[PDB]
């Protein structure tokens, strides 16, 4: 056991050299679980996977109010005032670096590369690996400020990925620019739809409380951000990036004044769906005064595959749990789509007129109140026109009240301490 420290630092001459090392130190502290530990991280690029299994821990950028969450170099780099926590496993591949707990281990890598075979087969999607999440939060009271969480699987070939041995397995998706193992460091060819599969940046476990992200960014494509059932999490002034089902799971979440950025390519089938909610009961997601928008070429993504001023139009979501899942879009501002893509895909709005799809789990309690369309269109009458049990008039609210009478407020989506 080591002493309690309320604040510990990460950086080349700080308390700890890696974020992993700092979390491991917290596991050894003589502290009550109620005593918070803040990990104050120097700006830098941290090629690490983390399991946060310690209560009341914060990850914060040492740059404070002057933190950046900007990407650079077509996704490959970050601002010098950014803290990026990144890793690269995704569905369909096994990795010589992967250890028994499904996380990267440099010592396992060395053994496996000497042996000529991996030691652990990647399950891929699902809760065994948390969709290969970079950061898996499995504790109460977790907070983060000014951090970029990323899975690079469909963003770029990282240093560590290029040095790993990556094995295509069941479900591997690849296009025509080389197999994943053969790509060199810095390649962005993995942004293409033909290489896309599920790879989470950030996953929250189930039954967790008091999780809050502030001024963070979460970077991925398919299944970027997961949160489990009965977890309360808030994302305040964050940026969430993705394509298919990029915010998913059964958490009771608030996205307060977030940028919701479609991270898609020119490929005609590369369409985004913001939410894929999976509640069996109770409250779902509250998207409160968010901005539906797009990534930018040269900072976030490679212009080779992103040729227009916006993403093509996408959708608010596709419910994963039938009937009982819940998402509320409240006071959303929706970009106008690039005029060329608007014509091609039949939508001036960056959200398709139908709004939602039944193509995952079915219909469920998907709501919209107070939309501003920057294009000036009014697609209210078109929303979910093909749905039969949750219909347009259930979804498109004229007053800010849900079907059970609940007023749409932040507090409606926070934990009720008496149960
Ligand atoms: Mg890779
Ligand atoms: Mg597949
Ligand atoms: Mg309305
Ligand atoms: N940026
Ligand atoms: Na860890
Ligand atoms: Na799987
Ligand atoms: Na790298």
Author numbering: 9 to 427
Sentences copied from the publication:
Pectin methylesterases (PMEs, EC 3.1.1.11, classified in the Carbohydrate Esterase family 8 [CE8]) are crucial enzymes that modulate the physicochemical properties and digestibility of plant cell wall components. These enzymes catalyze the de-esterification of the C6-linked methyl esters of galacturonic acid residues in the homogalacturonan regions of pectin. PmeC5 is a large modular enzyme that is characteristic of rumen B. fibrisolvens megaplasmids and plays a central role in degrading plant cell wall components and releasing methanol in the rumen environment.
Here we present the crystal structure of the catalytic domain of PmeC5 that is associated with a gene from Butyrivibrio fibrisolvens D1T that encodes a large secreted pectinesterase family protein (2089 aa) determined to a resolution of 1.33 Å. The apo crystal structure of the PmeC5 catalytic domain monomer was determined to a maximum resolution of 1.33 Å, displaying well-resolved and continuous electron density for the observable mainchain and sidechains. Molecular replacement was carried out using an AlphaFold2 model of PmeC5, with the structures producing near identical secondary structural arrangement (0.388 Å RMSD). The structure of PmeC5 was the characteristic right-handed parallel β-helical topology and active site residues of Asp231, Asp253, and Arg326 typical of the enzyme class. The N-terminal region of PmeC5 is composed of a short α-helix (α1) followed by a β-strand that aligns with and helps form the 10-turn parallel β-sheet, and the C-terminus comprises a single long loop (residues 378–423) containing two short α-helices (α2; residues 399–403, α3; residues 418–421). The overall structure of PmeC5 is maintained by an internal aligned core of hydrophobic amino acids (Ile16, Ile47, Leu67, Phe150/Ala152, Phe221, Phe243, Phe263, Met295, and Phe337) placed at equivalent positions on neighboring β-strands throughout its helical topology. The structure of this catalytic domain reveals a right-handed β-helical structure with relatively simple loops forming the walls of the active site to create a relatively shallow catalytic groove when compared with other PME enzymes.
